[PDB]
Amino acid sequence: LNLDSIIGRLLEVQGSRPGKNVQLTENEIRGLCLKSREIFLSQPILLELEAPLKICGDIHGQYYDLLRLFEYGGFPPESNYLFLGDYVDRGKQSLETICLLLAYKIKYPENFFLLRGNHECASINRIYGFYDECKRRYNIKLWKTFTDCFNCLPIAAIVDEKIFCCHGGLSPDLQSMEQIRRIMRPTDVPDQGLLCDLLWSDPDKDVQGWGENDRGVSFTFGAEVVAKFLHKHDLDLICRAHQVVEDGYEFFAKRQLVTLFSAPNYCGEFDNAGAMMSVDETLMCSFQILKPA
Template sequence: MLYLDKVNDNVSCRMTLGSSDAAMASDGELNVDNLIARLLEGKFSNFCQFYESGKSCTIAVRGCRPGKTVAMTENEIRILCNKSREIFLSQPILLELEAPLKICGDIHGQYNDLLRLFEYGGFPPEANYLFLGDYVDRGKQSLETICLLLAYKIKYPENFFLLRGNHECASINRIYGFYDECKRRFSIKLWKTFTDCFNCLPIAAIIDEKIFCCHGGLSPDLQSMEQIRRIMRPTDVPDTGLLCDLLWSDPDKDVQGWGENDRGVSFTFGPDVVTKFLTRHDLDLICRAHQVVEDGYEFFAKRSLVTLFSAPNYCGEFDNAGAMMSVLETLMCSFQVLKPSEKKNKFQYTNSTNRTQVPARTTELGKSKARP
């Protein structure tokens, strides 16, 4: 049986920075500890350090006055992509994970909010993490966001996991910001290196044989988990089919069975589809991302599916909160919510508690307010 509740925790931040001595990558080497330290340096100090080794790019970090920066080289980022790509290919495309861990939804280049999530949940390796995709595009700091996530993947390959989102695809992030950011700061060649890395990301995860996780949703083509395991990598995201649906589909309370998706890609699916899927595979919950939801998380189909969105004040245009789901070994889950900020750079956390039991494999219709 799976239980879910909303809790309040005090913010705890414990992180020791590595040496700030220059440790830029060269000749295929990468000092991942120093890279992580530099990416976090502005968060823990009132100043930022400059590096002038090789071709560098200024990257803004939280905690610094605007204009103060740390730097990474293009070569360093390329090595980061290649090493993480090797790790992705060495691990299954359908991950089988164990609790405890924390699950995060879309980040979309909102680097400061990514740091807030780590502040709340604990910086790796203090906690295990699963991210559901959409790390880049739309936000202003996609490079910082994806570089920190890939660095943590290299540093803690068995405790830190990244799934692929629909924006980890060249045809999408070519349009919505990541391509332009790579081109402006470094080169088109580096964007292509990221594309090679994204094409190797895992697609889905199952936690303790009870929680199915993916970025988008279900597919009418999905009858067996073995179908996911048979997807070969590296691969681009096709316009139709199983892989496309896992990254693009959406739940819809007004649909029975499968419906047309307003995105123009993939399908929508009703609560009945969720119920049948969970029953067939002896699962209790589907955890997905892909849609902005007002409270940062939102249930569907009698709490048998939950949507997570972890980028508060999305694009500066929404008043949504961001959320992270913590899964204990007992499969007791809590939602830690980052409330939307009224002013730029101001943030706060929720302070309310609401415990509810989630029925497994429900057959009744639920309500959803998820925005497309």
């Protein structure tokens, strides 16, 4: 596997018309899945990271918006990156998106990190685009290779003992951080339980405590649940994604939680911006906005 050639070919379409595909060989994509899978299993399922770091929300196959994120924040390894999941589905170029992220994970394993989102799940991305894209451009056997890779992604991260990061949100079953460490890999995402809630739950300003989620899966949680969680675990902030927000980032519970969404003009139906959060060594957080182009 020649990583540098794969990365160079993925970055070649920088500045081209949006939608221009990159043609990697099936064995090259298979090598990205197999080698990145090994690195995921060699690293904790609950990542403990250090600032400075840039944190990004959902990409959803919007590859050229991903390139905008790297051009704005600096291509690896100029900056460390943490992605919060949902790399495939909805968008038109899920393959280019995940292939570049996996390539950077192999190239800079200590400076580039990827969390699991609810769309890194075979039952979900079978419906919402990634299966169709794999079948159209390659084959279904490749889609299954991606599933084996997705099944080993880490679930959460804690930055400098203070920022708890996950795709979805909190769980009523999440009482100790060691519960996350006891999640075994490889694994599918269950329809209910701790691993499900971490990828599916949402904050809600109207709910007090826990409530039912209109998605039909997992829960909603209120501001007091966030406050008690941060106090119990001596954390300052929850950083999550999962939901599209108008400004690319959105605060919750008096800035005790922030939602990051990095796909501008999501699905072509929303007029939203995208955002990443920069965390410096003093944990000072700022937001870099991608306006919809």
